[PDB]
Amino acid sequence: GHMVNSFSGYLKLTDNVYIKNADIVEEAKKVKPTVVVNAANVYLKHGGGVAGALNKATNNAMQVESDDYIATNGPLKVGGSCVLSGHNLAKHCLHVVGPNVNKGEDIQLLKSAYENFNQHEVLLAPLLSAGIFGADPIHSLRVCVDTVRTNVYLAVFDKNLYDKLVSSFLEM
């Protein structure tokens, strides 16, 4: 009934990593997690992917807040994060920058990116550096599982990708 961080329909991969075929925006709206993770760039310019979807669900409040934050502080580091408002989706949004391997950024920074998750007991998150950032999503899930020690609920939008991640994980 009425709780916050109530996750449902996740496959338990390990003691602390869960995965679901779901839209992270729809999950955030239902669950109202303490922390939702944004797949951000260093400029917190929420064009496309997860960032575009989260911002649109806040009616652009996330972009307004992000514009103010970056004008004040300057860009993040690749592999870095910042905690900003979760607006109407969550208590907080953890903006995490994975490497963009399509722009020749170092894949090693994906581990740094996931390390940010360890400062929060429970997160709703997407797979970092997958899609337009061009990392292999199987590799991103492996780095997540090997790096994150806190409770992470992964939302994978694409049915085929979800099925491929689960089959490859539970047969290794």
Residues that bind ligand ADN (CB under 6 A): 23-25, 39, 49-50, 53, 126-127, 130-131, 137, 155-158, 161
Give the H or E element holding residue 77: none
- Give the nearest distance from C-beta 74 to ligand ADN in angstroms: 24
Q: Identify which of residues 74 and 126 has a Cβ nearer to ligand ADN in the complex.
A: 126
**Residues 53, 24 contacting (CB under 8 angstroms):** yes
- Distance CA(40)–CA(63), nearest Å, equals 11
- Give the nearest distance from C-beta 39 to ligand ADN in angstroms: 4
- Distance CA(165)–CA(101), nearest Å, equals 20
Q: Identify which of residues 49 and 68 has a Cβ nearer to ligand ADN in the complex.
A: 49
- Torsion sign (Cα): 168, 51, 8, 22: negative
- Distance CA(126)–CA(69), nearest Å, equals 22
Give the contacts of 15 (CB within 8 A, at least 6 positions apart). Answer: none
- Give the nearest distance from C-beta 119 to ligand ADN in angstroms: 20
- Distance CA(63)–CA(65), nearest Å, equals 5
- Distance CA(127)–CA(123), nearest Å, equals 12
- Give the nearest distance from C-beta 18 to ligand ADN in angstroms: 14
The residue number with the shortest CB distance to ligand ADN is: 131
Q: Identify which of residues 8 and 72 has a Cβ nearer to ligand ADN in the complex.
A: 8
Q: Identify which of residues 48 and 68 has a Cβ nearer to ligand ADN in the complex.
A: 48
Q: Identify which of residues 55 and 71 has a Cβ nearer to ligand ADN in the complex.
A: 55
- Give the nearest distance from C-beta 130 to ligand ADN in angstroms: 3
